[PDB]
Design an enzyme around this catalytic site. Sequence first.
Site, PDB file in Angstrom:
ATOM      1  N   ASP A  25       0.981  -1.227  -0.049  1.00 26.15           N
ATOM      2  CA  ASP A  25       0.015  -0.108   0.002  1.00 26.15           C
ATOM      3  C   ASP A  25       1.014   1.242  -0.129  1.00 26.15           C
ATOM      4  OD1 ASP A  25      -2.176   1.770   0.319  1.00 26.15           O
ATOM      5  OD2 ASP A  25      -1.735   1.877   2.310  1.00 26.15           O
ATOM      6  N   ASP A  27      -0.213   5.183   0.559  1.00 25.01           N
ATOM      7  CA  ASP A  27      -0.390   6.122   1.662  1.00 25.01           C
ATOM      8  C   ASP A  27      -0.378   5.732   2.900  1.00 25.01           C
ATOM      9  OD1 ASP A  27      -0.935   7.865  -0.783  1.00 25.01           O
ATOM     10  OD2 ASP A  27      -3.082   7.578  -0.629  1.00 25.01           O
TER      11      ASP A  27
END
Lengths: 290, 292
Positions: A25, A27
């Site tokens: 991932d 952010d």
Amino acid sequence: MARCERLRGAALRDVLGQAQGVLFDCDGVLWNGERIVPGAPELLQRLARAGKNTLFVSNNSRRARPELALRFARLGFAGLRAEQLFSSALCAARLLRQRLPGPPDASGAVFVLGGEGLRAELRAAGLRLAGDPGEDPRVRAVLVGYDEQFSFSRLTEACAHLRDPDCLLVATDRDPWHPLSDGSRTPGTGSLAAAVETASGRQALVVGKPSPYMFQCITEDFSVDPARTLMVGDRLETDILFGHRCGMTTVLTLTGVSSLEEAQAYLTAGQRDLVPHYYVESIADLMEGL
Amino acid sequence: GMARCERLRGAALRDVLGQAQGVLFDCDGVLWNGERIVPGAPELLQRLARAGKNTLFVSNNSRRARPELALRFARLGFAGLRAEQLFSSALCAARLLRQRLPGPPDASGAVFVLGGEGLRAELRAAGLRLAGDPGEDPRVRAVLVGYDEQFSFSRLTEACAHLRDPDCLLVATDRDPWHPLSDGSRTPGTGSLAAAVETASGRQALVVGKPSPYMFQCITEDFSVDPARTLMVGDRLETDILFGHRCGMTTVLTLTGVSSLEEAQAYLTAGQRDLVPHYYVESIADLMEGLE
Ligand code: BEF
Ligand code: BEF
Ligand SMILES: [Mg+2]
Ligand SMILES: [Mg+2]
């Protein structure tokens, strides 16, 4: 069955060696706003050198693939290929292209509640947008993304298109909100999607984590063995859940949205799909295994 | 009395009305559609009064404060009604918030409102101070979500900011998801805005309007209503009829509005008993044949 243990020392060396690849991932993991996570670029470099594949999966629907690639470079991650980058924007474009082809031709257009990046991702896939110049074709789908121009009149127009039952409803993701560097929050696509679904009386096809579709979209382009893949994310209900559903090994990092106690709370509540296998304070901690 | 969705006419109509002390009417889709009254609706109300049957009115419409709603009734031809008989989700939201936000003088804060001037006026009549009115905005102590034609991403953002404080209340006027307009199109309802606010804030809103029992409570503070002897008359299964079931009233679906007989019948065949009206009529005008 996930125990949420601190990945360090020997186990960490064993977990990394066994790995074919790491799904990151973005952010809350590689950066928070314009502040990179310390060690993050250096981590990626060492991963590559050790021949471990890296891929990036984000529910962020603001940036088309070229601008996301620029962001990586600008923030100091070098040597990435655009093909390694998956956002919900990209995968929504691909899902919509898939659902809207047919033996029939003369398809239609997509009405987009979203920004320029999401629009640009759809145009790049060859989809036409309601509101672009020229012909108004039949609107055949409404796409809900992160839409800072969201308004009551734009909600109303979405619902009008959705009165046609053949008009699809797609959402980039259901993330409910996101943290900003000033400590405030911004509503996520999930909140906009909830408004559109309720007003139209429809259920949206959701493309992003934790939906498996995000993983299909990825496996069309790369062979991924979920068993030898680490899924790394900061958000329990999107990243970890996604990872469990895809059969991957899951790592919560603490630099982002979820806390270690939220994870422990899920564990004590026996919601195993929301409990990570491992946690680290930061993805920098993974480096001691290389 | 398990609802069988039967057509209320003949002897059944005379019996049901005869046993009734009063009728609670939903307004939109029942007394009128837009600026067009349902033919016979004014006469019905008159004949109800003459027969000594009490009437009260509930609406999830949060656009008109009670005085203007009262003027609306008068203008469209409904004579003899008093404003105190009118219960909107706006009114009841103002009361819930007045109940919950009294305290010491210095404590009193403001209500941040997603809604129109009607709803604003309703809250000011209850003594509530509103964020965005002139002067100092005190501490925001509640967010109210109503029908908000000016809803926007930044105002959603601002609502959530207030809701970061766990002690700030979240109230919604109602959860009606959408409403018909006269041209056949639809406008999004409060339920859709509320869903956005609840999702972005991670909160559950206290809902004031039907089918929440709070609306019935708001009514029973002012009038004695025996639910067992009251008819609840509405056009919307998921709001009016469910409401009637939760309050223990006999429920009557009228077909001049949002729900159809076939929608009701499908709920029946599925055993979703709380969404099945006891009776239905084509129009509330039909009720008149049961009065002398
Ligand atoms: F980029 Be991830 F979806 F937070
Ligand atoms: F006036 Be009802 F709420 F339709
Ligand atoms: Mg994240
Ligand atoms: Mg109605």
